[PDB]
Design a protein around this ligand. Structure first.
Ligand SMILES: Nc1ncnc2c1ncn2[C@@H]1O[C@H](COP(=O)(O)OP(=O)(O)O)[C@@H](O)[C@H]1O
Ligand SMILES: Nc1ncnc2c1ncn2[C@@H]1O[C@H](COP(=O)(O)OP(=O)(O)O)[C@@H](O)[C@H]1O
Ligand SMILES: Nc1ncnc2c1ncn2[C@@H]1O[C@H](COP(=O)(O)OP(=O)(O)O)[C@@H](O)[C@H]1O
Ligand SMILES: Nc1ncnc2c1ncn2[C@@H]1O[C@H](COP(=O)(O)OP(=O)(O)O)[C@@H](O)[C@H]1O
Ligand SMILES: O=P(O)(O)OC[C@H]1O[C@H](O)[C@H](O)[C@@H]1O
Ligand SMILES: O=P(O)(O)OC[C@H]1O[C@H](O)[C@H](O)[C@@H]1O
Ligand SMILES: O=P(O)(O)OC[C@H]1O[C@H](O)[C@H](O)[C@@H]1O
Ligand SMILES: O=P(O)(O)OC[C@H]1O[C@H](O)[C@H](O)[C@@H]1O
Ligand SMILES: O=P(O)(O)OC[C@H]1O[C@H](O)[C@H](O)[C@@H]1O
Ligand SMILES: O=P(O)(O)OC[C@H]1O[C@H](O)[C@H](O)[C@@H]1O
Ligand SMILES: [Mg+2]
Ligand SMILES: [Mg+2]
Ligand SMILES: [Mg+2]
Ligand SMILES: [Mg+2]
Ligand SMILES: [Mg+2]
Ligand SMILES: [Mg+2]
Ligand SMILES: [Mg+2]
Ligand SMILES: [Mg+2]
Ligand SMILES: [Mg+2]
Ligand SMILES: [Mg+2]
Ligand SMILES: [Mg+2]
Ligand SMILES: [Mg+2]
Lengths: 307, 307, 307, 307, 307, 307
């Protein structure tokens, strides 16, 4: 008995996933009270069932997170069998340590503790900001890479001796993995000091593919593209998995030298961003549906990591 | 070493409490990141200290709650000694059971579990919606009544043989307590059936004092006042502790037959409500400051329940 | 594999429930050692089974509670699958908060913690004193109302314009629910001050039905009946779910003006009470058997709340 | 701030301990409600204090145990600093394993879990039935031997080449320890087969000292004394720490060949037993008072194990 | 789906058990990294399976224990259904209490806590040093006696009026059980004082069977055999379950008066010990295989305790 | 009351730290039993004290880890006040996630859970392999960088326009931090594909400083030095914090082109490595002593992160 439930964060992605599983979303009233508190009621029998909840903890982050945890509590008190939280974008993942013992929280651990406390039995995410967040849980956590879809899109561009560039130092590992997958090309690294951007590697007369896990504001992405074009690069493409696009992202991307921005659909796009002519979206519904299928049928999940 | 910290929910109440304790609020940067996630940094040494956090979980409820739990986590990882959460208004307290085994959450228990998980050592609240929420925690919970302040204000009205009325059946116990405190007057009960309001008790030619724990939308309060005046009551006064005032509350209170609405300051008022000429606010800063003083000095807290 | 086990608190109710499920009680030796400590031995295979334990925590309360928790521990170490505690009367439910921060325990929370610690997976009760005790547990708790049986008995009395009266202020909500179920009649409230009883509502020349969750000593019930008859009421009937009947209850009920006392069978009656001519018992075995049937077969439990 | 509290199990022992500490027992109302549920109220400030609760879990075992756990919960919610449970006799200690995987509970572990759940910080006991019960807790457990007092009494008897006998096989280790302390005498062992008692060791023409941790019914003790006298022993003395004396113990001890029965005061004696002419009581109040003194002042507890 | 996995501690015993279950060991790479840290990889699907891990925590104890806990963590994160730890010899079982409140650990409790923390669901052991270690866990623990195999071997020796001797005082209970099983013979006890060995019981002209749970160094066993032969015993046989054989055990057994040493196979023997001509090994693979079979099929485990 | 205790892993480092704190190491017997199990006895009063345990979990890793956890359990049962584990090198830190959902453990989380279970209150480490391991704990974890000491040593070399090189992609962040501290020089990255080493950045005619967190076998370090010298680098220096030096490290470093290897003293060096002429050791005893001093006196720990 596989049952799918959705929040208000990613309803269209949940509908696409349900379509690919040839089922329909479970019936649950999830809204707000008059004063703004989350209201949840499960409107069908879930006793002993195998429940999947699809919801990203994207902006508005706190409302979406409260929605998810309140759904889990409601399902657990209604005697559900197993609850899997499908969280395509995991919010608060960038607050994952205390640098220099700064008096800051580790909020990703706080969220993992909340999810474990309400009774989640498994978590399925896409491209966690830090892979070590798998260890913040006691339950199995499956971190699925979005790189197959993005690489499939890259290979249909016919790039001229492309080079893979990471816009910052934190993305070097991911950029190297993408480069090894992309016909084993070269990689370059953007190094930022003091306000100048230093490029390590040769980009003269080559197509540049900027790869990142997310695009939050686009300031550093636009600056990296500007530096790459100033050092003589033909075309610049930006590939990311999570389209956060917060703050002044639309204006930054509009007045930029990037030829194409390609993102996945873990977060719904705004009308502001969708109006842009050079922003393209790929879908992860098939990959997530296959992962849900394998989890539900007790099959091996390692098959999801092939290109 | 008593240190006070405040969130963004009730900063002026926290400042008043700090003034009455002859100290100043601790220095902590509490704001938002670009995408809307809560940002917290404690900017002073708190090692081994006795920390009090003042913040209501009022609207926007989820942001305020996340702010509180993230502050507690940051303080606990910074080696604070004891953390007391002063929550003048406790949000989600109305979701306290599952009626008829409805597939709903018990969200007050979820919030209590979150607070216990991040490391709170004591909770101090004002007029919990259900007193049994004290049992949702393992830590001491002090539920302080706001009835001394409201009764002091009532006794300066010179009411003509007043009668204490509860606007619904859930408030009968509180209304009876207020009536016994108010020179041992009579009490009447509003009974609602089907859309008509039935009044049990005699209100003909008497001043009526409606007492409630909160005013959320004011619809039932205005209806009760209308019924009381239709059964021949001279003047109607509304007394409450928590001024939620959500939805259409301002228009409901403007076009109403209530002579005076008196509330406490557990939730800041909007400009919409503050423009109203017949809404008056009492302060709880002295009572909360005395409670904090007694907790900090290891004195008996039972002295707080005298009129 | 549904297996029923019984303690020494309510053996005849357990036998009736087993009869209605067309099974027999499981074989377990549950007694005392020489010095009075509880002795338990499960005398059949329970590995992987779906176990229901039927036992009220009624007087002697502590022995019955220890019996229940020791049974649960014995079954859990014998590799039982799922353990449901059917507790028709939940003892210690009246100690559910600390009024005015009195240095008292919250013993209902203590008992819930004990039950959760030994390994109970679900609780099924009848008419909890406070519904918020559902939140004292992490496991599902089904609070089943006894009002269908009592209302069925009420409707066979042919009352003359009956009015529903709550003997105290704590029972107003339940009395209102019963009144709305009883052809939508009126309700009156007994208000006690200082030693006099004040009645809010008109009872002149009407049949009065006193409704309560329990009858502990009968002092307040007899006083309320006396006041109702003094204000000119034709007949007084007392309806309750839990027949505790402690202290001087038999003498109070014998020298009283109540025409009929009707109770359920969550607690066995003594010979003292059974000798009384105007005390009648209704059975809850059918309702509890249906609830157990629905829990065992993973059906919806919401069907149990219809009249 | 050392505060002593007592239950209703061992009030005179608690008073003696308080006398030896030159303090007085703390003021707390500990009784029963009308229906038999435990009632507790702490009538003094205990905030931040160092609390000791003196109560044996002796017969009636379940009432005493519930009294203790309810006291601990009340003190913990009243913000006590540290709670030490002084349990001179630990009930349910004989149910400490499952022999041959019998479907029985391990009730000593259940009681340890209850005590840990309510918030006990340290346990102090006398002559635990199994020393491994120390490992049933997470908190420090100090198991103090009563053998110094009993050995002091033995050495004032002027025994004629005494031999130390264990009435069963479970007491051989304790009997050997006593024998090594008693001028390094010999030891004999009572072996019971099938209904006959086999004695291993020579007892012809010697004084026999039977040593045990407890005397529950006295049947095996009287049988062992009978066998020892039949194999030609001059005088038989019985020494034990815990005087349970359940069932037919008084008649067994009256019609027995034992010259003297000496016990400690961990359990109050009945009038039935106190009427016996050959039963003598030693006091442990000094030893327990010294242990409490050392725990309170953060001194080494190893000094308590010298003769 | 029963799956067997083995560590590096007892691979041949695991292979024998797998042979008797007519299955094969599961495929898992369990070794060491370059620096000596344990490396584990499960090389087959275990989702929802019923997993048994066979590994003794014998010398090198800490490596074997870490191997076991790391395997359990790997299997739990791979979504295994139920994990049973089959630990034929349980290391650290001799550190089971704090005698005289010595500042020592209770390491058996530490190991039980580690096993419970990684997610073990059941433990199956052979001849625990202290049976109360069953209470150190929350999960079912089945302590299976090795006495059937040893008694079967004893009865094929044709002993001349044998007497069962325990080499120390801690083994008296086990020696008595063996004696009652061995045609209800007599038992004698070795008592050690100061450096001399005192024998309680008559051994003149009888065959002596020394029975113990383990043989660690053999010093006390050889001394007991020497004393027994000095008091005129014909032949001395040593029977034990766990062949630890540490330190100078081989030289002690070589220069000893023991005619035969018979042990089980819970710990692999060294070449040093296997070279000895009078050391014989019995197998427990059949008994453990039957226990695993009964656990897997949800049958009663009490059938394992018959001779 | 600050008390220092040491294991057998890093006794000389512990002695140096004790010397810099002008105290002496606490008296505790920490060794092995005959069969190889860890033996611990605390030989002084620690009641209420502030205890620091200094021990790296270096090779033999499992013995050292068991030593640490057993010490913590012994101290916690002896009523210690606060226990801080000073672990200069944290073993198992490289097993921090499951790549591609490989059926592997997260052993760093297992070790963190063990430490939290025995009762550690704070952890102090040096240069954790992954900083996110701070989130594997609930307690404060202070990750102190060793870069001040190494940078002080670097600045006394008089390098000719040095360039900072990371031997692999996982060390790029640390290499960049070191480069920014080292007069804001340039950085180069070693990229390994397929067996060839690709260098991103210009190293022609410059001094190269290889920086890493650890040196396990030295194979990749020697290969990186060889590649750097083949692309025309004057001198190559290797700087690391943790000198693991496992496997064939001594032969790799002997037959290498590295001019100097400088490491800290978190792990004792072998005689094999100490015989090498171009391996130099720096001490961290002063920095760790200052950190312990600040923790003990409740001072801010942020002062430890300045150069
Ligand atoms: N403001 C208030 N003051 C006093 N009691 C209150 C108040 N609000 C709610 N209550 C509840 O009303 C109940 C009345 O109990 P109490 O005041 O002791 O009188 P009695 O027990 O005689 O009815 C208490 O249990 C308390 O929890
Ligand atoms: N026997 C009963 N039947 C129905 N409700 C009851 C009963 N006893 C107590 N109650 C409580 O009375 C409250 C009345 O709510 P409800 O019956 O939904 O009507 P309304 O919400 O319109 O007042 C419920 O929250 C329920 O918890
Ligand atoms: N009253 C007692 N005094 C001393 N030991 C006792 C007593 N009762 C039981 N014992 C147990 O007897 C065992 C004997 O150990 P010990 O007295 O150290 O001598 P040895 O170790 O030489 O046999 C101890 O482990 C202790 O737990
Ligand atoms: N020795 C070190 N000194 C400083 N930072 C280090 C060191 N080793 C690793 N790091 C990491 O490098 C990251 C660089 O951040 P930071 O030094 O604040 O500069 P920026 O944030 O401008 O890149 C930090 O998050 C820190 O965790
Ligand atoms: O917020 P921006 O820097 O503009 O863009 C998002 C980046 O911030 C984080 O490093 C993310 O990993 C991205 O690299
Ligand atoms: O939301 P409204 O009914 O308009 O006003 C608030 C009321 O709703 C809850 O019962 C509260 O206790 C109040 O009585
Ligand atoms: O103990 P009595 O007051 O005599 O009768 C039982 C009552 O006490 C509690 O309020 C129960 O709810 C009943 O109303
Ligand atoms: O119950 P009885 O056997 O008569 O006397 C008490 C004995 O029962 C237990 O073994 C105790 O340890 C005693 O040896
Ligand atoms: O270590 P040894 O004394 O030489 O032989 C093992 C004995 O040590 C323990 O008591 C075991 O139970 C054995 O009796
Ligand atoms: O084991 P080696 O690769 O030879 O040297 C140690 C390296 O292995 C890990 O990445 C460490 O971080 C080091 O970079
Ligand atoms: Mg990052
Ligand atoms: Mg980035
Ligand atoms: Mg309500
Ligand atoms: Mg209301
Ligand atoms: Mg009540
Ligand atoms: Mg009542
Ligand atoms: Mg025993
Ligand atoms: Mg005995
Ligand atoms: Mg032993
Ligand atoms: Mg032994
Ligand atoms: Mg790494
Ligand atoms: Mg590396």
């Amino acid at each position: 008995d596989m049952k799918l439930f959705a929040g208000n964060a990613t309803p269209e992605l949940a509908q696409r996933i349900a379509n690919r599983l040839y089922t329909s979303l479970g019936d649950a009233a999830v809204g707000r009270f008059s004063d703004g508190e989350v209201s949840v009621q499960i409107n069908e029998n879930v006793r002993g069932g195998d429940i999947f909840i699809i919801q990203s903890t994207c902006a508005p982050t706190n409302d979406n997170l409260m929605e998810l945890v309140v759904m889990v509590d409601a399902l657990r008190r209604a005697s559900a069998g197993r609850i899997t939280a499908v969280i395509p974008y995991f919010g608060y993942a960038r607050q994952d340590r205390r640098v220099r013992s700064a008096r800051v929280p580790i909020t990703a651990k706080v969220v993992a503790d909340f999810l474990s406390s309400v009774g989640v039995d498994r978590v399925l995410t896409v491209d966690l900001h830090a892979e070590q967040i798998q260890g913040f849980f006691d339950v199995p956590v499956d971190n699925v890479f979005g790189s197959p879809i993005l690489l499939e899109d890259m290979l249909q561009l016919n790039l001229d001796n492309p080079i893979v560039v990471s816009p910052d130092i934190g993305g070097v590992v991911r950029a190297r993995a993408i480069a090894k997958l992309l016909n084993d090309t070269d990689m370059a690294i953007i190094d930022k000091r003091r306000q100048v951007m230093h490029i390590i590697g040769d980009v003269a007369g080559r197509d540049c593919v900027l790869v990142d896990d997310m695009i939050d504001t686009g300031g550093t992405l636009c600056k990296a593209a500007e530096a790459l074009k100033e050092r003589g690069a033909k075309r610049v493409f930006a590939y990311a998995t999570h389209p956060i696009f917060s703050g002044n992202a639309a204006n930054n991307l509009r007045n930029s030298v990037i030829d194409e921005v390609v993102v996945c659909d873990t977060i719904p796009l705004s009308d502001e961003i969708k109006s842009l002519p050079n922003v393209r979206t790929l879908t992860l519904s098939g990959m997530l549906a296959e992962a849900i299928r394998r989890i539900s049928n007790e099959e091996s999940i390692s098959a999801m990591f092939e290109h």
